[PDB]
Design a protein. Structure first.
Length: 315
């Protein structure tokens, strides 16, 4: 029906896979986020006073909304994962709201030098516990980054949120590579390997760990994808990337291959100074090197990473 305006199309109703609640049970206060198809607010449950987050969605892409509801319900009993408390539909505008638990966030960028080795281990371990539960349940998050990790510095509580890009994982299936966020994309995405796996979440978490250790968020740079690959290899070496592309039959431009053979790999040299030397422990750097392994199949699993000596104290 193409003569209709978009607003006339929302008034005239697809089905949501959820028993919809009452929009009057929830109040809305301050906008706290703006997204592609969503506006995010802080709010309260009226009767209990309990803080909530309200994610307000234009009623389009109903399939994808239903995917995210299904994922959030599969994950409802998981640790350190945002909890879907209700889904409601505005009777007038027909917009859909997801009611999520509230998790306080102190932006880690502004805590450089204030977060200790223990803070960083709690933060990372907390996200790994979420990823291990999601991965064991066949779900990959696909957008792990500081902006999707709620951290409470006083209480050390941590939450992995924003499951709108999450997907159910089936081995040997092709997935779209326009996922994750710039500078968090793994080599599998920059080289368009379609059959990637939940190990992508480990790379993205590794990029997060590198920013916290070295006081630089985002850690990796690069204007385009060939330069992003190149900037990765300044640290990790050209040869690992060349070997990776060969092994999985990924294409690199002839100009990029020659560039990569010039890069032996600095690893973390030059990045430790007096301000971050106290958190860049050998075990933290060893964990980092494992998580930022180029070959997605040789990265630790979430459970393997949780077994790392870097977490021996807080276990």
């Amino acid at each position: 029906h193409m003569k209709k305006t978009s607003a006339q199309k929302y008034q005239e109703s697809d089905e949501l896979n959820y028993p919809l609640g009452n929009i009057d049970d929830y109040s809305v206060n301050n906008r706290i986020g703006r997204g592609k198809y969503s506006n995010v607010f802080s709010g309260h449950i009226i009767d209990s006073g309990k803080p909530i987050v309200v994610k307000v969605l234009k009623p389009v892409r109903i399939m994808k909304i239903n995917r995210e509801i299904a994922i959030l319900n599969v994950l409802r009993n998981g640790p350190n994962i945002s909890q879907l408390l209700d889904v409601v539909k505005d009777p007038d505008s027909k917009y859909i709201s997801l009611i999520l638990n509230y998790a306080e966030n102190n932006d880690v960028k502004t805590l450089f030098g204030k977060m200790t080795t223990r803070d960083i281990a709690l933060y990372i371990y907390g996200v790994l516990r979420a990823l291990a539960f999601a991965h064991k349940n066949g779900i990959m998050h696909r957008d792990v980054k500081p902006g999707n990790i709620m951290w409470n510095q006083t209480t050390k509580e941590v939450s992995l949120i924003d499951w709108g890009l999450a997907e159910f994982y089936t081995p040997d299936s092709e997935y779209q590579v326009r996922v994750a966020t710039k500078y968090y994309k793994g080599p599998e995405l920059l080289l368009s390997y379609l059959k990637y796996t939940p190990s992508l979440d480990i790379w993205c978490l590794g990029c997060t760990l590198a920013g916290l250790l070295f006081h630089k968020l985002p850690f990796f740079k690069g204007r385009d994808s060939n330069e992003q690959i190149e900037r990765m290899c300044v640290y990790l070496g050209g040869q690992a990337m060349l070997d990776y592309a060969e092994k999985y039959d990924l294409k690199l431009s002839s100009s990029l291959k020659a560039r990569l053979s010039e890069l032996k790999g600095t690893m973390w040299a030059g990045l430790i100074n007096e301000s971050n030397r106290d958190i860049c422990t050998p075990q933290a750097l060893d964990l980092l090197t494992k998580m930022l392994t180029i070959d997605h199949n040789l990265r630790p699993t979430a459970e393997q990473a949780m077994k790392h000596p870097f977490f021996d104290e807080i276990r």
